[PDB]
Ligand binder design. Structure first.
Ligand SMILES: [Zn+2]
Ligand SMILES: [Zn+2]
Length: 60
């Protein structure tokens, strides 16, 4: 799970997730000009403990 915009993982709680395929810092997408609005649930993240980690490829 290496941010295609940074390339550095940790554990704290990266986003969106890791299972998907790639990671994107909630700030990168905004710092790059990719997304421009509420493109998620912004209700909970957690890059581990079960949860509703939604993403572009997630779907779930
Ligand atoms: Zn990044
Ligand atoms: Zn995902």
């Amino acid at each position: 799970e290496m941010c295609d915009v940074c390339e550095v993982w940790t554990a704290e709680s990266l986003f969106p997730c890791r299972v998907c395929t790639r990671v994107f810092h909630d700030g990168c997408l905004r710092r790059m000009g990719y997304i421009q609005g509420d493109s998620a649930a912004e209700v909970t993240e957690m890059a581990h403990t079960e949860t509703g980690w939604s993403c572009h490829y997630c779907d779930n």
